[PDB]
């Protein structure tokens, strides 16, 4: 019943990095619409002194995914990764920007 604060639309990658690098908690994130790949979504996440970027992929059925698990919406992909690491390399959990 309220808009998701993590959806920032078409903001440049550099802009997302500037904003997230200022965040204090690992996991602070946002979903943006990629410029380099029009029509694609990108997930930017604060982690330590860096900002990691993940590309949201879509399968033949139209489901969104990052690695192997599939989702019926960006909304479900995001909520799923609030409890399950968004990265297969390090343990990183999505947290709302503050």
């Amino acid at each position: 019943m309220k808009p998701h604060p993590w959806f920032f639309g078409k903001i440049p990658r550099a802009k997302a990095e500037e904003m997230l690098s200022k965040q204090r908690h690992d996991g602070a994130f946002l979903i943006r619409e990629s410029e380099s790949a029009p029509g694609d979504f990108s997930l930017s996440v604060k982690f330590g002194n860096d900002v990691q970027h993940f590309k949201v992929l879509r399968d033949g059925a139209g489901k969104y995914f990052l690695w192997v698990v599939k989702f019926n919406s960006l909304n479900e992909l995001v909520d799923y990764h609030r409890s399950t690491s968004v990265s297969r390399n390090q343990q990183i959990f999505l947290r709302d920007i503050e």
């Binding site: 990108s42 990691q52 970027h53 993940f54 590309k55 992929l57 690695w67 990265s87």
Partner: peptide, 4 residues
């Protein structure tokens, strides 16, 4: 991208 990390996952790519």
């Amino acid at each position: 991208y990390v996952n790519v």
